[PDB]
């Protein structure tokens, strides 16, 4: 299981304490909010730097 996860074949994780293999469901439909947040932060820092340099 560890080898399969490390090979990106398994989109999940292992709970060794309880002998459990917790697999992510991927039903969140995310990975877009991450891009939106990166865009927001990068361009807002960009605007702040531009304003500081121009003023």
């Amino acid at each position: 299981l560890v080898q399969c996860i490390l090979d990106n074949t398994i989109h999940g994780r292992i709970d060794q304490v309880n002998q459990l293999l917790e697999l992510d469901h991927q039903k969140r439909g995310g990975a877009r909010y991450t891009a939106l947040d990166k865009w927001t932060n990068q361009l807002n820092s960009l605007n702040q730097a531009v304003v500081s340099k121009l003023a």
């Binding site: 560890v2 090979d7 994780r13 292992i14 709970d15 995310g30 947040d37 605007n47």
Partner: protein, 412 residues
């Protein structure tokens, strides 16, 4: 720092594997950094130093050997340099050197570029034999002018690379490696030697990601490369740098695809086991061997300072890779995945969380490491609100700045 007290070094093999000034410097490094074995290292060093007309470094090595022998004469309660060597060496060295200087000045009066270049290379080699670093450079740095063929340029680059290693002018090595590679249209494997030159130069320059990439491209067909670095150390150098920088997928692809590092791993089975144990998640066996090889390469010429950072990076990467497949891993089992104690791992894990790239939380109650899987949306909203607050504050700041500039308010 370094200069530790470690036994079990094989002096005969390490001395014989290298040859030239490269051997002399390594033997000096081994003696100076490995006590309880410095005498035989110095005795073997001075035995090889007197060969090929050494003058200044001989006095330093002989003085160190004299001090070392004097130390042995007081513990279980100094050799003569045979100054006749000075009389013999100097008279012989000067006569041939002036004769070589004699022949070259004829070729300067005969005006042949290749002959001038070839003679200065011989003069540079003789100066390196005589123990004259800068003198060899100027011969090489004026032979560079009189180049005619691409092979002459390649020989010019190799000579400058060799000297700048001794001079520790690694910038000149990298510049000449780039010149020797990019210019001539990127059985005689010449690029392999150049890639080996870049790999060691980058490693001596505290560079790891490019050094491993260059070392992995080095083909084993080069075989005898003793003027710069032995193949045994090249495999060790490549494996350690690859382990610290290359990820699991990056490790597997590069090692297998190269097909020369597989041969390099065969020369050094210890580092081969490390990567295999790194791949198969057996970091307990991976790191215990790592400490075993540590003491050996802790007295390596261009490894001793760098490898401590490399080994520290190895430990960090191993911990990151180990906990990555687990959402909830017992710290006892993670502690049992090495010879470390529970408290020491907890401190190491806490440091890793503070630095980052582990994304975990420590539940010290039951000592279980729970992975952090924070939803992207909550953090996104929090930092967006923080960004909006900062933007409003900066808007107020620029509003005040505009007001004070329009009202001409300033201290006179």
């Amino acid at each position: 720092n370094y200069v530790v007290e470690n036994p079990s070094l094989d002096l005969e093999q390490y001395a014989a594997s290298y040859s030239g000034l490269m051997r002399i410097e390594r033997l000096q490094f081994i003696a100076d950094h490995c006590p309880t074995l410095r005498v035989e290292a110095l005795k073997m060093a001075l035995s090889f130093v007197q060969r090929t007309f050494n003058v200044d470094m001989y006095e330093e090595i002989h003085r160190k050997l004299s001090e070392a022998t004097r130390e042995l004469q007081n513990a279980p309660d100094p050799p003569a340099l045979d100054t006749a060597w000075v009389e013999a060496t100097r008279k012989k060295a000067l006569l041939k050197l002036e004769k070589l200087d004699t022949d070259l000045k004829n070729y300067k009066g005969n005006s042949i570029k290749e002959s001038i270049r070839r003679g200065h290379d011989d003069l540079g080699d003789h100066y390196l034999d005589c123990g004259d670093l800068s003198n060899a450079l100027k011969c090489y740095s004026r032979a560079r002018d009189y180049c005619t063929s691409a092979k002459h340029v390649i020989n010019m680059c190799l000579n400058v690379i060799k000297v700048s290693v001794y001079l520790q002018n690694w910038s000149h090595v990298l510049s000449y490696v780039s010149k020797a590679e990019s210019t001539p249209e990127i059985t005689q494997a010449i690029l392999t030697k150049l890639k080996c030159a870049a790999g060691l130069a980058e490693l001596a320059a505290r560079k790891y990601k490019q050094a491993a990439k260059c070392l992995l491209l080095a083909s084993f067909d080069h075989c005898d490369f003793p003027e710069l670095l032995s193949p045994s150390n090249v495999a060790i150098y490549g494996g350690l740098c690859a382990l610290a920088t290359f990820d699991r997928q990056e490790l597997q692809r590069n090692v297998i695809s190269s097909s020369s590092f597989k041969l390099f791993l065969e020369l050094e089975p210890q580092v081969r086991d490390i990567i295999f144990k790194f791949y198969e998640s057996k970091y307990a066996s991976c790191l215990k061997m790592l400490d075993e090889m540590k003491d050996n390469l802790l007295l390596d010429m261009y490894l001793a300072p760098h490898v401590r950072t490399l080994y520290t990076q190895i430990r960090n990467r191993a911990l990151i890779q180990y906990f990555s497949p687990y959402v909830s891993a017992d710290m006892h089992r993670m502690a049992a995945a090495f010879n470390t104690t529970v408290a020491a791992l907890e401190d190491e894990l806490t440091q890793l969380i503070l630095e980052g790239l582990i994304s975990a939380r420590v539940d010290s109650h039951s000592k279980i490491l729970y992975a952090r899987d924070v939803d992207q949306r909550s953090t996104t909203f929090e930092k967006s609100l923080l960004m909006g607050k900062e933007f409003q504050r900066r808007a107020k700041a620029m509003m005040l700045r505009a007001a004070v500039l329009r009202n001409q308010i300033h201290v006179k």
